Amino acid sequence: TIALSEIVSVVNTSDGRLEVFGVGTDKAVWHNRQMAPHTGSPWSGWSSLKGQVTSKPVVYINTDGRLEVFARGTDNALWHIWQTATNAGWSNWQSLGGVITSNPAIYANTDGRLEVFARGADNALWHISQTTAHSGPWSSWASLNGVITSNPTVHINSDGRLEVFARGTDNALWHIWQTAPDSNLWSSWESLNGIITSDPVVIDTADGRLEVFARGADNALWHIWQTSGPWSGWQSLNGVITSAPAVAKNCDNRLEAFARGTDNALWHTWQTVSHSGPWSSWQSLNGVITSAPTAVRDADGRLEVFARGTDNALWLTWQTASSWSPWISLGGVLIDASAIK
Amino acid sequence: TIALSEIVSVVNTSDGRLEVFGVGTDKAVWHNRQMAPHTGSPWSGWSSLKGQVTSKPVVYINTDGRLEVFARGTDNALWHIWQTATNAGWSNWQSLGGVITSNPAIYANTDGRLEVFARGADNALWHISQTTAHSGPWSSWASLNGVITSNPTVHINSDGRLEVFARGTDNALWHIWQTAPDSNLWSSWESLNGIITSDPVVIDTADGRLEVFARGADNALWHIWQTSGPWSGWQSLNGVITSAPAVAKNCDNRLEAFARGTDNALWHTWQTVSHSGPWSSWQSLNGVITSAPTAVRDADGRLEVFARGTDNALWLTWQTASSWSPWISLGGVLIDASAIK
Numbered sequence: 232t233i234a235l236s237e238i239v240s241v242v243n244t245s246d247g248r249l250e251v252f253g254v255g256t257d258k259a260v261w262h263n264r265q266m267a268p269h270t271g272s273p274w275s276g277w278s279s280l281k282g283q284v285t286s287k288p289v290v291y292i293n294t295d296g297r298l299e300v301f302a303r304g305t306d307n308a309l310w311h312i313w314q315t316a317t318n319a320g321w322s323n324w325q326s327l328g329g330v331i332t333s334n335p336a337i338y339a340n341t342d343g344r345l346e347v348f349a350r351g352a353d354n355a356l357w358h359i360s361q362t363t364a365h366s367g368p369w370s371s372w373a374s375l376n377g378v379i380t381s382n383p384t385v386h387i388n389s390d391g392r393l394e395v396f397a398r399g400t401d402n403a404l405w406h407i408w409q410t411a412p413d414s415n416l417w418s419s420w421e422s423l424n425g426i427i428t429s430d431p432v433v434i435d436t437a438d439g440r441l442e443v444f445a446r447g448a449d450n451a452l453w454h455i456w457q458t459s460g461p462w463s464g465w466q467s468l469n470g471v472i473t474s475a476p477a478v479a480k481n482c483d484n485r486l487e488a489f490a491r492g493t494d495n496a497l498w499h500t501w502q503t504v505s506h507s508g509p510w511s512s513w514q515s516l517n518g519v520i521t522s523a524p525t526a527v528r529d530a531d532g533r534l535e536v537f538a539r540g541t542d543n544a545l546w547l548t549w550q551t552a553s554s555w556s557p558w559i560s561l562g563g564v565l566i567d568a569s570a571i572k
Numbered sequence: 573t574i575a576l577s578e579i580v581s582v583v584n585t586s587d588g589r590l591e592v593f594g595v596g597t598d599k600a601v602w603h604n605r606q607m608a609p610h611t612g613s614p615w616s617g618w619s620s621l622k623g624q625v626t627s628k629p630v631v632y633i634n635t636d637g638r639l640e641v642f643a644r645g646t647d648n649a650l651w652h653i654w655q656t657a658t659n660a661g662w663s664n665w666q667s668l669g670g671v672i673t674s675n676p677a678i679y680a681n682t683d684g685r686l687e688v689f690a691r692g693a694d695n696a697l698w699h700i701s702q703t704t705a706h707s708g709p710w711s712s713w714a715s716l717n718g719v720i721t722s723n724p725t726v727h728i729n730s731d732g733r734l735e736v737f738a739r740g741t742d743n744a745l746w747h748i749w750q751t752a753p754d755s756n757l758w759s760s761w762e763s764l765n766g767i768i769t770s771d772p773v774v775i776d777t778a779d780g781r782l783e784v785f786a787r788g789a790d791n792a793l794w795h796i797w798q799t800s801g802p803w804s805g806w807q808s809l810n811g812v813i814t815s816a817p818a819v820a821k822n823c824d825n826r827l828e829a830f831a832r833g834t835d836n837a838l839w840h841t842w843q844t845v846s847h848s849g850p851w852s853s854w855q856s857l858n859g860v861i862t863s864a865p866t867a868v869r870d871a872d873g874r875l876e877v878f879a880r881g882t883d884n885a886l887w888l889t890w891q892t893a894s895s896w897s898p899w900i901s902l903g904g905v906l907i908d909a910s911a912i913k
């Protein structure tokens with residue numbers, strides 16, 4: 232098992248608007264969109280992209296600005312749906328086949344080819360890629376092996392090499408990386424040790440280093456980062472958290488971590504002064520939440536945070552000059568469809 | 573002729589540091605680098621990448637994070653030099669041949685292929701591209717036709733289509749665009765009218781629109797922007813400017829324009845409140861400058877501005893909480909090698 236998951240996938244669109252993707256009681260993917268590229272923008276309200284999903288639905292933006300949403304189907308295949316033109320209409324759901332046992336994890340290669348990662352029936356990591364930039368057809372599936380006990384997460388190195396992180400059977404953080412950008416050449420799995428009780432979250436720093444966040448054995452927030460040299464040790468950011476963490480960059484590149492606390496309110500800790508700076512003490516953004524928070528930077532360079540409420544609606548709070556906005560409701564009824572819990 | 577040009581090309585590196593590229597009295601390309609990814613970082617001082625250039629040297633970052641610098645040689649061919657690995661050593665200067673009569677203009681296609689644009693001996697626009705992502709070999713040269721009287725500038729649409737802007741023989745702003753991302757299919761040249769007395773500067777807004785800035789017949793700063801619909805009219809931002817303009821985005825996405833005034837000090841006007849906001853009155857950042865300013869956002873989300881001084885050194889001022897830093901000198905002796913003046 233893992234700390235309570237994020238309930239939505241969120242993206243900044245090609246035209247600077249937040250769009251969120253979640254799952255209803257009907258197992259359909261639902262979609263909510265800012266009208267305008269600004270903090271406090273009116274929202275579309277929830278509309279259905281349909282389908283029937285047995286994972287968290289994960290949106291990624293193609294290098295041509297077209298959104299594409301990936302989800303496990305009821306047949307355990309990888310399914311996807313995409314915009315046919317930038318911020319226009321959607322395709323039908325189409326199958327990329329395979330059998331997967333995790334939420335999908337997506338990144339664009341430096342050549343614009345999307346590559347999707349998911350656990351398989353053998354509990355190994357499997358991957359499939361676009362054969363050409365922002366387009367089908369897709370490659371055959373293949374395995375990157377290993378044995379994983381969490382949803383996988385992928386990011387890109389500052390040199391364009393994809394890198395995947397996942398919990399192993401010993402509950403350590405393990406990783407594997409491309410040896411060259413755009414490559415089918417990968418490293419062996421390597422252990423970053425520690426003991427993690429959440430899905431790992433990965434982000435690139437202002438200075439092009441991967442930094443990984445996860446809940447530890449002691450239910451504190453831990454992190455570890457790249458220094459072609461080795462990783463740091465695991466370091467505690469303290470706190471006591473009851474969900475997966477979420478991490479986003481402020482527009483000045485200061486990292487900021489969010490998680491549900493023991494009082495089921497939203498808590499956050501941030502780098503102070505600069506992206507090189509020391510982390511703040513944990514502070515409360517209130518609310519009562521029934522999901523991990525989901526954090527994203529909007530087109531005004533402000534953080535916005537989404538979480539499911541006691542009513543199972545999605546609620547939203549954002550940064551102001553002085554503080555954070557009171558929680559507002561975007562309505563809907565959201566379920567946690569995470570293929571791993 | 574055109575308003576006085578920018579004297580350096582600047583890039584934010586894969587690890588968040590500013591690096592500047594200019595030309596010495598010897599016609600070699602010289603290089604200055606921040607040590608650390610922060611405002612007010614110590615600088616390397618000027619070191620030579622050698623070569624012999626008859627244009628402004630233009631740096632672009634490959635999708636694998638490798639810097640690549642393009643310049644006209646003494647033989648009027650396009651030449652380039654690149655990092656062999658991300659923020660490591662440089663290749664030798666190599667020729668991409670052709671005969672060009674402008675500074676080169678560079679963008680990455682959505683598939684990671686760099687595409688270079690330059691005026692030819694026939695005064696038409698010519699282009700050459702990497703055949704695969706972030707790598708040689710390069711295509712054959714070909715022409716996109718037209719007749720141009722300024723350095724060309726290229727940007728990417730929010731849908732991944734490259735678009736090139738240049739002054740025509742009637743002194744209007746003209747443009748041409750890819751009809752599909754990564755394509756060799758281009759539109760006809762079209763006129764955006766107006767009368768411009770500087771190279772055009774192009775930037776993408778927070779909401780994914782191209783916005784073009786240029787000095788007008790009245791030596792005011794003018795701009796025009798995308799609304800698949802038509803462009804705005806030309807609108808004046810007033811001022812009286814004696815150089816090319818420079819434009820950069822604040823970390824909250826507010827556009828900010830810089831130019832030399834009649835008193836040969838640096839002047840700037842900025843969007844207020846938000847990226848949707850009205851433009852400020854022009855205000856002075858002092859100094860006495862012998863080049864257009866060059867503006868870039870650093871890894872702390874602050875604007876830094878470079879300009880040649882009366883001593884022909886490069887000087888530097890940046891945003892603070894309240895105001896801007898006093899001008900400091902980064903030394904060197906820089907010449908304006910712009911292939912068009």
Ligand SMILES: C[C@@H]1O[C@H](O)[C@H](O)[C@H](O)[C@H]1O
Nearest residue numbers: 388394408459460461462
């Ligand atoms: C710098 C290098 O980057 C790799 O992608 C991986 O993270 C290795 O652990 C690290 O040593």
Ligand SMILES: C[C@@H]1O[C@H](O)[C@H](O)[C@H](O)[C@H]1O
Nearest residue numbers: 487501550551552553554
């Ligand atoms: C503006 C400032 O941003 C910080 O990163 C943190 O989120 C604080 O709560 C907020 O007041």
Ligand SMILES: C[C@@H]1O[C@H](O)[C@H](O)[C@H](O)[C@H]1O
Nearest residue numbers: 729735749800801802803
């Ligand atoms: C939306 C469309 O975009 C094109 O790239 C070009 O700028 C056209 O003028 C404009 O009408």
Ligand SMILES: C[C@@H]1O[C@H](O)[C@H](O)[C@H](O)[C@H]1O
Nearest residue numbers: 828842891892893894895
């Ligand atoms: C911080 C603020 O930023 C504005 O965009 C403008 O550059 C002002 O001069 C500066 O004081």
Ligand SMILES: [Cl-]
Nearest residue numbers: 266272273274
């Ligand atoms: Cl409204």
Ligand SMILES: [Cl-]
Nearest residue numbers: 376377419420
């Ligand atoms: Cl292995």
Ligand SMILES: [Cl-]
Nearest residue numbers: 234472473474
């Ligand atoms: Cl818990």
Ligand SMILES: [Cl-]
Nearest residue numbers: 607613614615
């Ligand atoms: Cl120092």
Ligand SMILES: [Cl-]
Nearest residue numbers: 717718760761
């Ligand atoms: Cl034409």
Ligand SMILES: [Cl-]
Nearest residue numbers: 575813814815
């Ligand atoms: Cl003048």
Ligand code: NA
Nearest residue numbers: 340341412413
């Ligand atoms: Na890659």
Ligand code: NA
Nearest residue numbers: 384385386433
């Ligand atoms: Na990721």
Ligand code: NA
Nearest residue numbers: 388389439440
């Ligand atoms: Na990296």
Ligand code: NA
Nearest residue numbers: 542544560562
């Ligand atoms: Na509600």
Ligand code: NA
Nearest residue numbers: 681682753754
């Ligand atoms: Na393109």
Ligand code: NA
Nearest residue numbers: 725726727774
């Ligand atoms: Na450009």
